[PDB]
Structure 1
Amino acid sequence: PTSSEQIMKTGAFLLQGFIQDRADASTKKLSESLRRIGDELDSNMELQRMIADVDTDSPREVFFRVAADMFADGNFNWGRVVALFYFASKLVLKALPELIRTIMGWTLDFLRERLLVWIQDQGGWEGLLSYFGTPTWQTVTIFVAGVLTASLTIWK
């Protein structure tokens, strides 16, 4: 649950499950709530414009500095993790097989290197269900879009 092994395994499934959309009961609830936020984010034309306004050449550079920017204050919140996974899945489209593995690899690297301890401090990925368990949880979209927009600006 809070073990790093499980957190990486679960993160891998949630990301794989996520990317396969743009292309037990508690974890299904996460998959589906991420999906819904993804669907709404995909309707934000300002956000999709910015994600198109970024050089797909050298994906490793843009992925990692975007991810580092969202987390440059040394703090954590689930909206930033949602933004990261969403941006990774958009990079898969912006360049497309092995691309999927590579970007998942970069993302998994960032999670292990930077997010692991925070997610442990949340009780694991169960924390993300807490983040989703509110009234009007769908307005979390506005927040995740904001986090993504600020991070593409510096790049842009």
Structure 2
Amino acid sequence: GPLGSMSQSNRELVVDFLSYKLSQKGYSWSQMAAVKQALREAGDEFELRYRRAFSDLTSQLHITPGTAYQSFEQVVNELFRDGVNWGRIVAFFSFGGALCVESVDKEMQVLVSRIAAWMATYLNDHLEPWIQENGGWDTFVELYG
């Protein structure tokens, strides 16, 4: 298969394609596939609607090469200052996405895999308990799918 970050399997490519085509017909490869698709669409809608807020995010959010997770965390804490909800979680993904895009634009491709790791960290440590306690991603799909 094509070279991926963690393997190069042909199954992974097949499963990706089949997941896509099932979702187009209102079906799902799996619950994870359904969550992924729901979040993509949630992200798309949020970005179009709140497009004015997506300008020079690397500056406003202070994300540069050499940023450390602790700095990333203080920044993202501000988004959730008044509590966690699904809308803010969507925003978290969307802002993170826009930052990876901005990074590549600026020939700072090196930030992409670091932003991914920081997001994962923050999810695990700050958001997972709220998510679990509020129905899991199953509830997200019921609300945003």
Partner Cα distance (1:56, 1:82) in 2: 19
Contact 1:56 1:95 in 2 (8 A): no
Name the aligned partner's letter for residue 47 of structure 1: A
Instruction: State which drifts further: 39-48 or 101-110.
Output: 39-48
**CA RMSD in angstroms, aligned pairs only:** 2.8
Q: Larger Cα Rg: Structure 1 or Structure 2?
A: 2
Deviation at 1:89, TM superposition (A): 1.1
State yes or no: 1:38 paired with 2:43: yes
Aligned to 1:66: 75
Aligned to 1:27: 32
Structure 1: segments with no counterpart, 5+ residues: 1-16, 18-23, 134-156
Over 4 Å off, 4+ runs: 58-62
Specify which structure has the bigger relative contact order, considering alpha-carbon pairs within 8 angstroms and separated by 6 or more residues. 1
Aligned to 2:13: none
Task: Write out per-residue CA displacement over residues 108-127 of structure 1, whole angstroms, 9 at most, x where no aligned residue.
Answer: 11112111211111232212
Q: How does 1:29-108 map to 2 (within 5 A)?
A: 29-44=34-49, 45-49=51-55, 51=57, 54=60, 56-57=63-64, 59-60=67-68, 63-73=72-82, 75-96=83-104, 98-108=110-120
Pairing partner for 2:126 from 101, 114, 139? 114
Q: Which has the higher helix share?
A: 1
Deviation at 1:49, TM superposition (A): 2.9
Partner Cα distance (1:32, 1:53) in 2: 30
Structure 2: segments with no counterpart, 5+ residues: 1-15, 17-28
Deviation at 1:71, TM superposition (A): 1.6
How many correspondences in the alignment? 110
Instruction: State which drifts further: 49-58 or 84-93.
Output: 49-58
Q: Percent identity?
A: 27
**TM, length-normalised to structure 1:** 0.56
Q: Structure 1 residues 85, 37: closer, same or farther in 2, change over 3 A?
A: same
Partner Cα distance (1:105, 1:127) in 2: 25
